[PDB]
Amino acid sequence: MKIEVKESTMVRPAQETPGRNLWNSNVDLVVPNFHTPSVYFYRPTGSSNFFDAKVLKDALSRALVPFYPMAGRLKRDEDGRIEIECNGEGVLFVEAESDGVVDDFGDFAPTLELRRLIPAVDYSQGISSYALLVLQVTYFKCGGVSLGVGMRHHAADGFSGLHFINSWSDMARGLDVTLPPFIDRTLLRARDPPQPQFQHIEYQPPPETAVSIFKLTREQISALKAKSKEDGNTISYSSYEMLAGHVWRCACKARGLEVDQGTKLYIATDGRARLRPSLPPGYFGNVIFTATPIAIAGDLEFKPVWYAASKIHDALARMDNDYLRSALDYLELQPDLKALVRGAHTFKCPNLGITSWVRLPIHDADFGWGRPIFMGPGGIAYEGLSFILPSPTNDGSMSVAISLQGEHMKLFQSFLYDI
């Protein structure tokens, strides 16, 4: 069902904010143009002012005071490096309406259908033209509402963007920001001189699509974790390791790769706790590093799930302060950072990528009318990319959203639920 635009506003900060050219660290620069957009769904409560646009716009405005750089624009320094000009220009807030309803979306799988709930940007007018944040509220025929979110990635990672949405929602409820952002990315300066200690494969470029979401209950996760006993393995891995291993292996098995073929899994990892000393709480920026375990598909399939899990485990444990400092230094010495961005090539078969939203507060956005019944990626831009979502109800379950070739999706599902 078509989606009509009712109203559009460039929401500026509630009062004047200070100016500043906000320096971008190397991990702020090695990101795609835009974050994976996100979508929330809420159910009507009966209340007459359910998601009152005015209440929201004002709330947005007030939130953009402590989070001022979010109202900024991308510009370049003397050296061609990208920085955020804190000019207070603001964020785009769009009011839309649909003749269809919320159940029309079913399982909320991140198909193309969902992109229509986030606004489309003209990222073809120069880098200073467009907003860092676009927000869309869509009003539904059965009283339901979706909030849709697009954030240009140079502004911040998912952890920091969500810090902002959440704080916006607190403000709607007449609260102040519980934890004010700390704004200074120079804490991620490379060392001088830059002296890398590893090779960083994660950053060296290689020289009909279906999308689905599959729920796994608390009991299936638990059964799945228990497979760590198979063939007398004595080492326990976490639920995440086993489930991410299981996803990798199901993808390999369903894609039908040969025994002797290589598969790289790309894993996104939050540096916030790994760094020493650790960042200030509410650090506003990007802090995602990448672990890339590598395997022969023969091994992954023909060994128990715990093998795949063990590769994910090793790769992640390696991501300590030394590795991350080294990766900052590695990036410092590279001639062109945008050359190193992972495109549609990176995840095509036989490779894969997996992001976990499990530790993200994706469900804390209560604007005064309750928590969302779902929050998820609003569209998947590439085949071979998958997301893992905690339960909107804290009932131990988890979903796997993933895009593959449509041919592989039937076997993929078959193998996922073989527990």
Place this chain on the structure above:
Amino acid sequence: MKIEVKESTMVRPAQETPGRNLWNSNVDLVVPNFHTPSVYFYRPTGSSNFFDAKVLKDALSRALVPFYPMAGRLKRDEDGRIEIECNGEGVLFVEAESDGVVDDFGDFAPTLELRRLIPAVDYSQGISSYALLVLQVTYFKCGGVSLGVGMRHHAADGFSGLHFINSWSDMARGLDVTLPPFIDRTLLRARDPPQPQFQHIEYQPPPETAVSIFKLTREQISALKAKSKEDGNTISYSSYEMLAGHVWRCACKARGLEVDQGTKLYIATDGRARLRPSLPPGYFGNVIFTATPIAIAGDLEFKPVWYAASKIHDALARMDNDYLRSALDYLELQPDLKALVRGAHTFKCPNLGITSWVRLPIHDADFGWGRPIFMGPGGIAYEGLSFILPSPTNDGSMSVAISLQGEHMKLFQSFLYDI
């Protein structure tokens, strides 16, 4: 030219040696039946008693006193585990003669031709039948001599077998053993209870042939090491890392693997210095562990040699005391150790294996008539296996002995000398 057997003797220790059932550690058990056999070549000196068989047999006899278990036989304990029965039965010493000459062997490449200089064993009569050590001295028409050596691997690794040959040669010169062997493999007991910390892929079984030797001078090794600067890499690797990387990559490139294909390199590594506390000097046994770096052939080829070198570097640095203790414990928990032996499957294309004799005293065997002009593997049992040899003259050069499919050998050579 045919090789005729003149005389055969089962050389027992010079006097009575003590009895003992010598326990085998887990790394003593996860070895093939026989070591790669070795061959030495010496030039005539003019002396009338050049390699006098009698002088040698007596010397052997005297050496087998401190190294008594070498004169032993394999037997099994109550549990079916293999141990060495120290019964003094002795070592086979064979005297042969050839109508051909030493130059007939040319570059000394480990072809089938060289197997004929080591005696053939009847390893088809039960495990107590045959000797642990067989030695052959061949006398040549131009006055030259080859010593050929076969050692059943349960007895010891190359480091320990060479400790023995060398000590034998000292004794021929009327010297005693410079460093007496320490005999007790219980220093490599697994922990109780056994608690592995890693998965040990090295030990989990997968579920027309040419042989050549290529010399690389001190200057080519040196040029090759210098390639570590390419594309602004700031990390230096050793000569060994770069040359082993280079060998791996040349093999991949010459075999003509696809971009997306996996290649495992198997690397033999001496645990003697890595363990904490370190073994006693002259430790008599096996102490070889295995590092297995893994790659996509696309990356190896299409990146500079230093990438391949960096994988070998990481894999080797991981081999610390914790990893080795963990690998002992891993083996303790496995139901069948002979199941885990690397066969002809392990090294076939697209995989490879590389052993380095660079730190081995392969040239110290002077029996009173000088050091050998060559020492090397006397035959290569599998395609995909390669050896690296230090210079018989300490002139900085190194050779690469390797077996491949004959088709790949021409390109292999081409790519090896592209420096």
